Amino acid sequence: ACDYTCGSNCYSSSDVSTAQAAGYKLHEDGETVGSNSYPHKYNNYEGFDFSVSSPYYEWPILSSGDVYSGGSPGADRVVFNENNQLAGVITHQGASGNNFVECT
Ligand SMILES: Nc1nc2c(ncn2[C@@H]2O[C@H](CO)[C@@H](O)[C@H]2OP(=O)(O)O)c(=O)[nH]1
């Protein structure tokens, strides 16, 4: 229903929940996938106004609807904390360098 718009990508609440659930599970088990080994800590260099407390972890959310399994992560990420609360949804689309902007 387009709850989150990351550039040209559109994600529903359930899309985010599904991605987040998968990312948190690997985190619990101490597993990582991909050349950038996700999920990993997100330091919030961008200084986003997150309402949930740290630490935060970034995990890829795919436009195709599939759960990330180590391949190409793309530009979008879901950010969750240790309580498995959604901190936010961010993206490299529309940003410079390796910076992020929040999906609206
Ligand atoms: N842009 C950005 N990168 C972060 C942050 N936290 C950790 N990183 C990592 O710090 C480096 C510089 O941005 C990258 O390795 C990046 O990981 P990702 O590339 O996986 O996002 C953050 O809050 N913002």
**Nearest CA owner, ligand 1 atom 24:** 45
Query: For residue 58, how far is its CA from the centre of ligand 1 (angstroms)?
Result: 9
Which technique was the structure solved with, according to the deposited record? X-ray
List the CATH number of the domain containing 62.
3.10.450.30
Resolution in A: 2.0
Map tokens 């619990």 to a residue: 28
- State the residue range of the domain holding 80: 1-104
**Nearest CA owner, ligand 1 atom 1:** 99
Q: CA–CA distance from 67 to each of 27, 31, 40, 60, 71 (Å)?
A: 14, 15, 16, 8, 10
- Residue of 64, 46, 55 lying closest to 83 (CA atoms): 55
Which tokens is 55 given?
């630490």
Could you give the number of structural domains in the chain?
Answer: 1
Q: Is 40 a catalytic residue?
A: yes
* DSSP β-bridge partners for residue 90: 77, 102
Q: Which three-class secondary structure string do you get for the chain?
A: CCCEEECCEEECHHHHHHHHHHHHHHHHHCCCECCCCECEEECCCCCCCCCCCCCEEEEECCCCCCCCCCCCCCCEEEEEECCCCEEEEEECCCCCCCCCEECC
> What is the distance between the alpha carbons of residues 35 and 90, in angstroms, rounded to a whole number?
19
Q: Is 82 a catalytic residue?
A: no
